[PDB]
Amino acid sequence: VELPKRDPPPGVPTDEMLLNVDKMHDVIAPAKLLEYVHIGPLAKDKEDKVKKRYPEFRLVNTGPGGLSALLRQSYAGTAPNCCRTFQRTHYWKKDGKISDKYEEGAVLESCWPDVHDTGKCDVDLFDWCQGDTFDRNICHQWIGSAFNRADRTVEGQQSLINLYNKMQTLCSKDASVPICESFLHHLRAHNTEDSKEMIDYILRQQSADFKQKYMRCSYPTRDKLEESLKYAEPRECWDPECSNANVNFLLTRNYNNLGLCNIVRGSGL
């Protein structure tokens, strides 16, 4: 008996059906948590290839015909690869080497977006910014950003206080090392009673050799102090020791007195 046959209309694929995961390394890498990145139809044999390329993601079968998507679950970026730069958000691992650019057979590893807005880098950078590995740009920006730490929760705030105690202990031993001169400077720019108090504590803890070399404006000689009583203005306004001093090594009292010298219109000294 005859049958009324009819073929369906020709298929018209959408953008999703034409997606190829092997072309989307720059689409998948910036993906965030709770975000589905559709990658199109994926054959069964290419599932391990995709899952090993993106271990931080879960491969989800979203629709028929093998339609799949990737959902970021975590960030596996390590401190030495994420903390010593502010511009690299991810990197690729292949044959034991680390590269900024993608290559077939590599494994994606991504950094937390807030890795420098929290204290997740304080431990690694506390050691890296000492000694020969000191990078002036990265380390100054690290210390400076800690003062305006965007993580204002009780945890980001507490990690900030833990870092201050470590820097206070370290810089009390020697405040001349570059990371400590930067910490003293940023305390000065913060301009609070706590930061000023920590400055005086660190500088007063220094050795006699440090004070004789850098803090002669704070500790004048007998003849210098006795002569300064003959003038009405503060000693810091005329003392050559204070005009040649490193402002990061001045006690808070001396630093405040430097801005009380009555500058005549123009240059007043």
Partner: peptide, 21 residues
């Protein structure tokens, strides 16, 4: 005699090093 501390007519202070702090 030796000076230990001083204060200007404006209020700025200064100390001898062995008594500073």
């Amino acid at each position: 005699r030796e000076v230990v501390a001083t204060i200007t007519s404006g209020g700025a202070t200064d100390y001898q090093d062995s008594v500073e702090g």
